[PDB]
């Protein structure tokens, strides 16, 4: 599910992500970041959050 290396973590949240895509999947992963604050990454199928 969630994996962290160095300072960036990728999450295989594709399920939600799929729904998200219809509503801007890209945008969603950003959300994860929004929630945290540090930095975020979005991929068409997986959501990634980058901690502080």
Question: Which residue from 17, 35, 16 is spatially nearest to 26, judged by alpha carbons?
Answer: 17
Q: How many CA atoms lie within 13 A of 9 on its CB side?
A: 14
Burial tier of 23 (Cβ tally within 10 Å: 0-12, 13-18, 19+): exposed
Q: How many CA atoms lie within 13 A of 39 on its CB side?
A: 4
Is the Cβ–Cβ distance between 52 and 39 less than 8 Å? no
Experimental technique behind these coordinates:
NMR
State in Å, rounded, how far the first CA of the chain is from the last one: 19
- The enclosing domain of 38 has a CATH number of 3.30.30.50
Distance CA 43, CA 27 (A): 10
Q: Structural domain of residue 43, as residue ranges? A: 1-52
Distance CA 34, CA 31 (A): 4
How many domains is the chain built from? 1
């Amino acid at each position: 599910e969630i994996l962290i290396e160095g300072n960036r973590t990728i999450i295989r949240n594709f399920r939600e992500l799929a729904k998200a895509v219809n509503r801007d999947e890209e945008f969603f992963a950003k959300y994860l970041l929004k929630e945290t604050g540090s930095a975020g990454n979005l991929e068409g199928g997986r959501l990634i959050l980058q901690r502080r």
